[PDB]
RNA sequence: CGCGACCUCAGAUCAGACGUGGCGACCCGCUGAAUUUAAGCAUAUUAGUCAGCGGAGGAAAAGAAACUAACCAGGAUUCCCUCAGUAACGGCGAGUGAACAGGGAAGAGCCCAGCGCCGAAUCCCCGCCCCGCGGCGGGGCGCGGGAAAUGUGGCGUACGGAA
């Protein structure tokens, strides 16, 4: 029953919501585990860059973000064949490659 | 492939291949390419030429 | 009944064997809390199921 | 005196059997004495005789089974008793050689493009 | 290659030649029982393109599925409930008849593993499929590095869990904006991810 | 004669002990167990009785093989070898 | 050959006999029901004494898996005596009593004296 | 008439293997209500939820676009924040309800069929010899036996490939 001036609300609590309540008490443990696995991988790959392969320059898709660059998936095959590196050697020497990327300019 | 490349001087075809569709196309192909073709009684006797149990065509 | 099966006779034999009071020499153990056998069974009172 | 197990490995099956039979006869006499009403000494020796029976039998079984394992060691087919009894899944899993053998194509790929060791200057 | 010619033959199912073949084969499979082993695949090209090979350890089972829809097994058509749930006749089964076929084939052949299946005929009251099964403990399969993936225990009873192609077809999974109610592992996974109250420690 | 008088005519039983689960729930005329369904290959178990589920499960019995399995897993299922003799 | 019956019966084929490439089990099992393990102890009650004195019988308690033939052979082996007949019953406790009557030329009193019950 | 092939189909306590059933907190595939809310109730809601059935693993499922976008374009799958209680659905009532882009955790890609070319160049099994042997494997020898031309192995797969 509404009473006086208020804002009428629509709580999505009509299902069996108490059966699915995902708590976050293991969040610090998860952070510790992630950091420990990160250190283990970094020490395993001894001299290689700890952050994996290099990645290319990428423009964000939509008009809202198309003024910003970021890191993409991998370098494109046109870029590889213009740089002179081989498709199957780039990954061995540590360069991210994807055959999906086009080059419109 | 030999028939469609014209390297076969004649073709022998079995008559009782238990899916007939493995060779049902073959006579028309052989006629169109020009090579002679024959139907021989018995894929078993045809496969006796090779050392195998059965052969459809040679 | 007098007409029994081997299985039922064996079961009755086991129940009769376990219907027994405790020996007194266990009452003098160190960490002993048992005072009597609380799983007794009188034929008239408890009918054992079956 | 005190029947142990170290002094029984070097013996032979026939005297092992005769010692076992003598021990069984002694145990039977002890049980008769128990039922008729005897001495606490014999009542206590009953368990000693039983354990002596147990160790004689286990020595016999161990010698027999080790001999049989030596017999079947070189053969390809051997009894399920002599096969290794790991878990069922570990018996069904791919064995070491055939889960490591690999195709010629991808082994050629590995030999043509090995993963290099590299570093990047800061 | 003759396989391409066979491919176009089986694409021209409507011609008189294929009509004769389907009529005869359907009659023969109808005379036969509902679950039997075919010595050879009836469509070698189709089985090969589905993943079959002429080796030892591959078997083909030809099985028959009664045709039609699924009616609700309710006593005397009395669904005690609301009118929305009263229908028992025009209902349909979520899975496909090919998937049902593979399921019962694998169920009978417990020690074998189902790869795929194809269509070989149909009449008014029955459909016929040939299921391609693999014996996982044959050494000719165990020692092949490109097909020993089927020996792993994780692939046990694929057709029961809907991992074969026919089972995947009825799961509504795939890339794109059409399959939005499956993003995640499956439909249940998407539902569970969406219907859960994430309560952070600090909210 | 609805109660006391009719209670006196009960002299032959409808259930006996079954071979599988040992409970007095083996129906004689049906030849089926009321608790586990003995003739059926699969154990009779339902999700609407948690108490019945926990009364007889893996945690309730002797664990004859599976406890030894746990003990052997702790060391990795070793076989064929013996500790270094003195 | 011509057919004289309008039925078709499955022809009888050659059924070859098992030859195992390896025995299923490593060794034959040991007979755990031997003479010593088949007889446990002789009864020493007043009824047993009356029986041994009067009917020339010997009263033993054996295990439930023994039959009269095995009991007779076990008594013959252990005590070197001849056995006429054996009566058996299973007691309400679970043990299986045995009444063993001896041949007329043996003396049950002497057998009891040597075995150790009196 | 007899004999010999192949094809389909039988019987074996034939030689060697494999499946069954249990637990089921998490996972996959089917089946699937009604209490309740709507201040009545039938669509709707509860809810693809409980109950029921089947199938696994140490994780499962998914997964390398028949994608998103309409930008100066991004680029497998899975998870977290936000998008957003939004677009939309709804006796447009009660109620229900995503995804794209953005930031992150992780980051790995590949293989067939088909078209072709290589004297089937391919695989399984039995016997001897040598070694290894508690994951049954390596090598030599058999005018040894089978599978396979109704198609095995090598190169090769949309990023093009072959000569
Ligand atoms: Mg108020
Ligand atoms: Mg009473
Ligand atoms: Mg290849
Ligand atoms: Mg409905
Ligand atoms: Mg449904
Ligand atoms: Mg998969
Ligand atoms: Mg479709
Ligand atoms: Mg009745
Ligand atoms: Mg069950
Ligand atoms: Mg056999
Ligand atoms: Mg199961
Ligand atoms: Mg209401
Ligand atoms: Mg109300
Ligand atoms: Mg009402
Ligand atoms: Mg409704
Ligand atoms: Mg709904
Ligand atoms: Mg449920
Ligand atoms: Mg497990
Ligand atoms: Mg997986
Ligand atoms: Mg692709
Ligand atoms: Mg907002
Ligand atoms: Mg909903
Ligand atoms: Mg996104
Ligand atoms: Mg990272
Ligand atoms: Mg090929
Ligand atoms: Zn039962």
PDB file of C-alpha atoms in Angstrom, chain A:
ATOM      1  CA  UNK A   1       0.000   0.000   0.000  1.00  0.00           C
ATOM      2  CA  UNK A   2       1.472   3.333  -1.081  1.00  0.00           C
ATOM      3  CA  UNK A   3       1.463   6.091   1.524  1.00  0.00           C
ATOM      4  CA  UNK A   4       1.690   9.784   0.616  1.00  0.00           C
ATOM      5  CA  UNK A   5       4.344  11.083  -1.780  1.00  0.00           C
ATOM      6  CA  UNK A   6       6.820   8.338  -2.602  1.00  0.00           C
ATOM      7  CA  UNK A   7       8.383   6.683  -5.623  1.00  0.00           C
ATOM      8  CA  UNK A   8       6.712   3.417  -6.575  1.00  0.00           C
ATOM      9  CA  UNK A   9       9.297   0.680  -7.016  1.00  0.00           C
ATOM     10  CA  UNK A  10       9.604  -2.701  -8.735  1.00  0.00           C
ATOM     11  CA  UNK A  11      11.846  -5.015  -6.684  1.00  0.00           C
ATOM     12  CA  UNK A  12      12.817  -8.176  -8.569  1.00  0.00           C
ATOM     13  CA  UNK A  13      12.538 -10.383  -5.487  1.00  0.00           C
ATOM     14  CA  UNK A  14       9.536 -12.527  -6.413  1.00  0.00           C
ATOM     15  CA  UNK A  15      11.588 -15.597  -7.356  1.00  0.00           C
ATOM     16  CA  UNK A  16      13.457 -17.938  -4.984  1.00  0.00           C
ATOM     17  CA  UNK A  17      16.250 -15.417  -4.640  1.00  0.00           C
ATOM     18  CA  UNK A  18      17.577 -16.660  -1.293  1.00  0.00           C
ATOM     19  CA  UNK A  19      18.568 -19.982  -2.864  1.00  0.00           C
ATOM     20  CA  UNK A  20      21.014 -18.156  -5.183  1.00  0.00           C
ATOM     21  CA  UNK A  21      22.988 -15.575  -3.171  1.00  0.00           C
ATOM     22  CA  UNK A  22      26.643 -15.477  -4.250  1.00  0.00           C
ATOM     23  CA  UNK A  23      28.684 -14.027  -1.392  1.00  0.00           C
ATOM     24  CA  UNK A  24      32.205 -12.642  -1.777  1.00  0.00           C
ATOM     25  CA  UNK A  25      33.872 -13.793   1.443  1.00  0.00           C
ATOM     26  CA  UNK A  26      36.568 -15.612  -0.552  1.00  0.00           C
ATOM     27  CA  UNK A  27      37.524 -12.442  -2.442  1.00  0.00           C
ATOM     28  CA  UNK A  28      40.856 -11.825  -0.624  1.00  0.00           C
ATOM     29  CA  UNK A  29      41.713 -15.512  -0.971  1.00  0.00           C
ATOM     30  CA  UNK A  30      40.971 -15.329  -4.695  1.00  0.00           C
ATOM     31  CA  UNK A  31      43.169 -12.244  -5.047  1.00  0.00           C
ATOM     32  CA  UNK A  32      46.021 -13.993  -3.220  1.00  0.00           C
ATOM     33  CA  UNK A  33      45.625 -17.082  -5.408  1.00  0.00           C
ATOM     34  CA  UNK A  34      45.596 -15.009  -8.603  1.00  0.00           C
ATOM     35  CA  UNK A  35      48.718 -13.106  -7.565  1.00  0.00           C
ATOM     36  CA  UNK A  36      50.510 -16.321  -6.596  1.00  0.00           C
ATOM     37  CA  UNK A  37      49.673 -17.950  -9.937  1.00  0.00           C
ATOM     38  CA  UNK A  38      50.835 -14.775 -11.686  1.00  0.00           C
ATOM     39  CA  UNK A  39      54.185 -14.937  -9.892  1.00  0.00           C
ATOM     40  CA  UNK A  40      54.504 -18.659 -10.631  1.00  0.00           C
ATOM     41  CA  UNK A  41      53.929 -18.131 -14.355  1.00  0.00           C
ATOM     42  CA  UNK A  42      56.302 -15.153 -14.443  1.00  0.00           C
ATOM     43  CA  UNK A  43      59.087 -17.138 -12.788  1.00  0.00           C
ATOM     44  CA  UNK A  44      58.392 -20.142 -15.030  1.00  0.00           C
ATOM     45  CA  UNK A  45      58.872 -18.108 -18.214  1.00  0.00           C
ATOM     46  CA  UNK A  46      62.275 -16.934 -17.074  1.00  0.00           C
ATOM     47  CA  UNK A  47      63.499 -14.075 -19.336  1.00  0.00           C
ATOM     48  CA  UNK A  48      60.372 -13.468 -21.418  1.00  0.00           C
ATOM     49  CA  UNK A  49      58.143 -10.439 -20.780  1.00  0.00           C
ATOM     50  CA  UNK A  50      55.882 -11.147 -17.822  1.00  0.00           C
ATOM     51  CA  UNK A  51      52.819  -9.754 -19.643  1.00  0.00           C
ATOM     52  CA  UNK A  52      53.016 -12.138 -22.597  1.00  0.00           C
ATOM     53  CA  UNK A  53      53.280 -11.152 -26.250  1.00  0.00           C
ATOM     54  CA  UNK A  54      53.145  -7.654 -27.676  1.00  0.00           C
ATOM     55  CA  UNK A  55      49.830  -6.428 -29.064  1.00  0.00           C
ATOM     56  CA  UNK A  56      48.943  -3.807 -31.694  1.00  0.00           C
ATOM     57  CA  UNK A  57      47.320  -0.372 -31.786  1.00  0.00           C
ATOM     58  CA  UNK A  58      43.529  -0.534 -32.090  1.00  0.00           C
ATOM     59  CA  UNK A  59      40.814   2.088 -32.490  1.00  0.00           C
ATOM     60  CA  UNK A  60      37.682   1.557 -30.430  1.00  0.00           C
ATOM     61  CA  UNK A  61      34.672   0.657 -32.613  1.00  0.00           C
ATOM     62  CA  UNK A  62      31.745   2.906 -31.841  1.00  0.00           C
ATOM     63  CA  UNK A  63      31.344   6.675 -32.259  1.00  0.00           C
ATOM     64  CA  UNK A  64      31.326   7.048 -28.480  1.00  0.00           C
ATOM     65  CA  UNK A  65      34.881   5.681 -28.160  1.00  0.00           C
ATOM     66  CA  UNK A  66      36.343   6.041 -31.668  1.00  0.00           C
ATOM     67  CA  UNK A  67      38.732   8.791 -30.489  1.00  0.00           C
ATOM     68  CA  UNK A  68      40.744   6.398 -28.287  1.00  0.00           C
ATOM     69  CA  UNK A  69      43.336   3.719 -28.980  1.00  0.00           C
ATOM     70  CA  UNK A  70      43.826   0.484 -27.055  1.00  0.00           C
ATOM     71  CA  UNK A  71      45.440  -2.950 -27.297  1.00  0.00           C
ATOM     72  CA  UNK A  72      43.801  -5.467 -29.606  1.00  0.00           C
ATOM     73  CA  UNK A  73      43.885  -9.220 -30.129  1.00  0.00           C
ATOM     74  CA  UNK A  74      46.866  -9.638 -32.455  1.00  0.00           C
ATOM     75  CA  UNK A  75      48.641  -8.189 -35.444  1.00  0.00           C
ATOM     76  CA  UNK A  76      47.089  -8.684 -38.866  1.00  0.00           C
ATOM     77  CA  UNK A  77      48.552 -10.716 -41.705  1.00  0.00           C
ATOM     78  CA  UNK A  78      48.974  -7.655 -43.918  1.00  0.00           C
ATOM     79  CA  UNK A  79      50.979  -5.997 -41.144  1.00  0.00           C
ATOM     80  CA  UNK A  80      53.132  -9.119 -40.775  1.00  0.00           C
ATOM     81  CA  UNK A  81      53.843  -9.421 -44.492  1.00  0.00           C
ATOM     82  CA  UNK A  82      54.680  -5.717 -44.706  1.00  0.00           C
ATOM     83  CA  UNK A  83      56.969  -5.932 -41.658  1.00  0.00           C
ATOM     84  CA  UNK A  84      58.704  -9.005 -43.104  1.00  0.00           C
ATOM     85  CA  UNK A  85      57.956 -11.475 -40.294  1.00  0.00           C
ATOM     86  CA  UNK A  86      56.540 -14.927 -41.000  1.00  0.00           C
ATOM     87  CA  UNK A  87      53.104 -16.017 -39.813  1.00  0.00           C
ATOM     88  CA  UNK A  88      54.361 -19.111 -37.992  1.00  0.00           C
ATOM     89  CA  UNK A  89      57.568 -17.501 -36.655  1.00  0.00           C
ATOM     90  CA  UNK A  90      55.898 -14.449 -35.135  1.00  0.00           C
ATOM     91  CA  UNK A  91      54.182 -16.494 -32.429  1.00  0.00           C
ATOM     92  CA  UNK A  92      57.408 -18.350 -31.628  1.00  0.00           C
ATOM     93  CA  UNK A  93      59.323 -15.089 -31.172  1.00  0.00           C
ATOM     94  CA  UNK A  94      56.490 -13.566 -29.146  1.00  0.00           C
ATOM     95  CA  UNK A  95      54.123 -11.571 -31.370  1.00  0.00           C
ATOM     96  CA  UNK A  96      50.344 -11.888 -31.172  1.00  0.00           C
ATOM     97  CA  UNK A  97      48.745 -12.771 -34.517  1.00  0.00           C
ATOM     98  CA  UNK A  98      45.150 -13.013 -35.663  1.00  0.00           C
ATOM     99  CA  UNK A  99      43.944 -13.782 -39.205  1.00  0.00           C
ATOM    100  CA  UNK A 100      40.568 -12.118 -38.564  1.00  0.00           C
ATOM    101  CA  UNK A 101      41.686  -8.478 -38.570  1.00  0.00           C
ATOM    102  CA  UNK A 102      41.173  -6.404 -41.711  1.00  0.00           C
ATOM    103  CA  UNK A 103      43.035  -3.222 -42.664  1.00  0.00           C
ATOM    104  CA  UNK A 104      40.707  -0.565 -44.066  1.00  0.00           C
ATOM    105  CA  UNK A 105      43.261   2.282 -44.095  1.00  0.00           C
TER     106      UNK A 105
END
